[PDB]
Every structure is written in structure tokens, then in C-alpha cells.
Design a protein around this motif. Structure first.
Motif, PDB file in Angstrom:
ATOM      1  N   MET A  83       0.844  -1.188   0.000  1.00  0.00           N
ATOM      2  CA  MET A  83       0.000   0.000   0.000  1.00  0.00           C
ATOM      3  C   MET A  83       0.882   1.242   0.000  1.00  0.00           C
ATOM      4  O   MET A  83       1.874   1.303   0.732  1.00  0.00           O
ATOM      5  CB  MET A  83      -0.910   0.006   1.224  1.00  0.00           C
ATOM      6  N   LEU A  92      -8.041   4.144   0.284  1.00  0.00           N
ATOM      7  CA  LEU A  92      -8.790   3.066   0.924  1.00  0.00           C
ATOM      8  C   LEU A  92     -10.013   3.604   1.658  1.00  0.00           C
ATOM      9  O   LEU A  92     -11.074   2.966   1.669  1.00  0.00           O
ATOM     10  CB  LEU A  92      -7.873   2.306   1.881  1.00  0.00           C
ATOM     11  N   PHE A 123     -11.523  -5.345   6.431  1.00  0.00           N
ATOM     12  CA  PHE A 123     -10.380  -5.015   7.286  1.00  0.00           C
ATOM     13  C   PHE A 123     -10.828  -4.574   8.672  1.00  0.00           C
ATOM     14  O   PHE A 123     -10.208  -4.933   9.675  1.00  0.00           O
ATOM     15  CB  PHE A 123      -9.542  -3.898   6.659  1.00  0.00           C
ATOM     16  N   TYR A 124     -11.905  -3.792   8.749  1.00  0.00           N
ATOM     17  CA  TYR A 124     -12.318  -3.261  10.049  1.00  0.00           C
ATOM     18  C   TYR A 124     -12.809  -4.344  11.007  1.00  0.00           C
ATOM     19  O   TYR A 124     -12.932  -4.065  12.208  1.00  0.00           O
ATOM     20  CB  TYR A 124     -13.387  -2.189   9.843  1.00  0.00           C
ATOM     21  N   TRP A 147       1.021   2.325   9.631  1.00  0.00           N
ATOM     22  CA  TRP A 147      -0.308   2.847   9.942  1.00  0.00           C
ATOM     23  C   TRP A 147      -0.743   2.250  11.268  1.00  0.00           C
ATOM     24  O   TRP A 147      -0.433   1.087  11.554  1.00  0.00           O
ATOM     25  CB  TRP A 147      -1.303   2.457   8.836  1.00  0.00           C
TER      26      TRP A 147
HETATM   27  C1  LIG Z   1      -9.039   0.495   4.873  1.00  0.00           C
HETATM   28  N1  LIG Z   1      -7.674   0.467   5.406  1.00  0.00           N
HETATM   29  C2  LIG Z   1      -7.161   1.641   5.879  1.00  0.00           C
HETATM   30  O1  LIG Z   1      -7.824   2.675   5.859  1.00  0.00           O
HETATM   31  C3  LIG Z   1      -5.705   1.675   6.254  1.00  0.00           C
HETATM   32  C4  LIG Z   1      -5.066   0.366   6.614  1.00  0.00           C
HETATM   33  C5  LIG Z   1      -5.607  -0.765   5.786  1.00  0.00           C
HETATM   34  C6  LIG Z   1      -4.867  -1.929   5.627  1.00  0.00           C
HETATM   35  C7  LIG Z   1      -5.372  -2.979   4.895  1.00  0.00           C
HETATM   36 BR1  LIG Z   1      -4.312  -4.537   4.647  1.00  0.00          BR
HETATM   37  C8  LIG Z   1      -6.630  -2.917   4.328  1.00  0.00           C
HETATM   38  C9  LIG Z   1      -7.388  -1.781   4.504  1.00  0.00           C
HETATM   39  C10 LIG Z   1      -6.904  -0.717   5.269  1.00  0.00           C
END
Ligand SMILES: CN1C(=O)CCc2cc(Br)ccc21
Length: 209
Positions: A83, A92, A123-124, A147
Motif C-alpha cells: 500500500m 482506501l 479489514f475493520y 499505519w
Molecule cells: C481500509 N484500510 C485503511 O484505511 C488503512 C489500513 C488498511 C490496511 C489494509 Br491490509 C486494508 C485496509 C486498510
């Protein structure tokens, strides 16, 4: 140098719903993160067919699951496409805004949290089991970033100075005190077998010393 960002209102609302709703079937978080890893691996594999040099940062395409009882963390590592900083701060979250709205509408119509991945915001689901999530990621076109968020409406992004990853993403789940079952080998094996048995990349479950 740590930058702090506010989540969009709708995403903050989704994370509060995930953290606060009573929902016993928490194990689906692992399926969602492994699915994300498999999509990221699909993307670098496909890109490499027309530009082989995209694998100069690593030819192996795999997923590793690393529990650590001393730190109370479960790490999901993949060597996918990774990413960029713009992904982490902007892109994202832009996608996740419409997926969240669709998911909330579904939930009010009768759906349950387990269907979250059909809306692109799986992811959440990490926050079903994690009090904090740290994501280390490296894309071929950008630097290595960390992150991090403990929910509460904000996240941070910083340039990462740790062990260089080559390429891919590492999701570090800092588990809630009552969720340590997801550090046990037999429990992780059961979940992978139940929900992720046909993923087209080797999944290695590391064991603890
Ligand atoms: C939606 N999202 C974020 O906003 C930041 C970190 C992230 C990592 C992965 Br792996 C998938 C989605 C996210």
C-alpha cells in the motif's frame, strides 16, 4: 515524525459499531484479513505478468500467521502488492465510505456482521478482537510505512524505520485481553481450515517457542 488523521465520520461510526455491538462470532476476522492478503497477492502476481521486474522486491507469494503470547499479538504477513502512502491516507477510505453505507443499510435490513467482506470493508473486522491494529506496508512505488489506530476516531501514519519488508503488508493485531484464544495453534488451525481452506497461496501458521 508521526502524522495524525481523523477518520471520516462514516468509518468512525462503523468501527464503533464493530467494537460495541454484541456479536459472538468474532473468528471471521481472520478470514477477512486472509482474503485481503490473497487479493493483494493476486494483484502483484497479475502485474508481474507484464512487468517481471515488479518481483525484484521478492518472488515468493505467501501468507504467514505469527502468534506471539509475550506481546499478545497475532500478525498476518503477506508479500502482496502493498500500500502506498496515498492508499493509507486517502484511497482506501474513499472506497470504504460507500462500502460502509451499503453495509449499514444491509445490517438494518437483517444482515449480520459476518457478511462485512461482501461490502469491501472486511479489514475493520480486526477490531472484533484487537484493541489496536498496526499495519506495516511497502509498495514498489513508495517507502515503507506504519499505519496505526486504536479507534476512537483517529489513526496515525509514519515512515517506518524497522526491518525492511521488501514488499507486502503486515497486519499486527494487538489482542483484547479476553481474546487470547486466537494465539493458540489449535484454534487458528481450526479457523483457517473452516474459512480459508481454498486460498491459492501457502498459508504457514508459525508456532511459538
Ligand atoms: C481500509 N484500510 C485503511 O484505511 C488503512 C489500513 C488498511 C490496511 C489494509 Br491490509 C486494508 C485496509 C486498510
Amino acid at each position: 515524525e508521526v502524522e495524525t488523521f481523523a477518520f471520516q465520520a462514516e468509518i468512525a461510526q462503523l468501527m464503533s459499531l464493530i467494537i460495541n455491538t454484541f456479536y459472538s462470532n468474532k473468528e471471521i476476522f481472520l478470514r477477512e484479513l486472509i482474503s485481503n492478503s490473497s487479493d493483494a497477492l493476486d494483484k502483484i502476481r497479475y502485474e508481474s505478468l507484464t512487468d517481471p521486474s515488479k518481483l525484484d522486491s521478492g518472488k515468493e507469494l505467501h501468507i504467514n500467521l505469527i502468534p506471539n503470547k509475550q506481546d499478545r499479538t497475532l500478525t498476518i504477513v503477506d508479500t502482496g502488492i502493498g500500500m502506498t502512502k496515498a492508499d493509507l491516507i486517502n484511497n482506501l477510505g474513499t472506497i470504504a465510505k460507500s462500502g460502509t453505507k451499503a453495509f449499514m443499510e444491509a445490517l438494518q435490513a437483517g444482515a449480520d456482521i459476518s457478511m462485512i467482506g461482501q461490502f469491501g470493508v472486511g479489514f475493520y473486522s480486526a477490531y472484533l478482537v484487537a484493541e489496536k491494529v498496526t499495519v506495516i506496508t511497502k509498495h514498489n512505488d513508495d517507502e515503507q510505512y506504519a499505519w496505526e489506530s486504536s479507534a476512537g476516531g483517529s489513526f496515525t501514519v509514519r515512515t517506518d524505520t524497522g526491518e525492511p519488508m521488501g514488499r507486502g503488508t503486515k497486519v499486527i493485531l494487538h489482542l483484547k485481553e479476553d481474546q487470547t484464544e486466537y494465539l493458540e495453534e489449535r484454534r487458528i488451525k481450526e479457523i483457517v481450515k473452516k474459512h480459508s481452506q481454498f486460498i491459492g497461496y501457502p498459508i504457514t501458521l508459525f508456532v511459538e517457542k
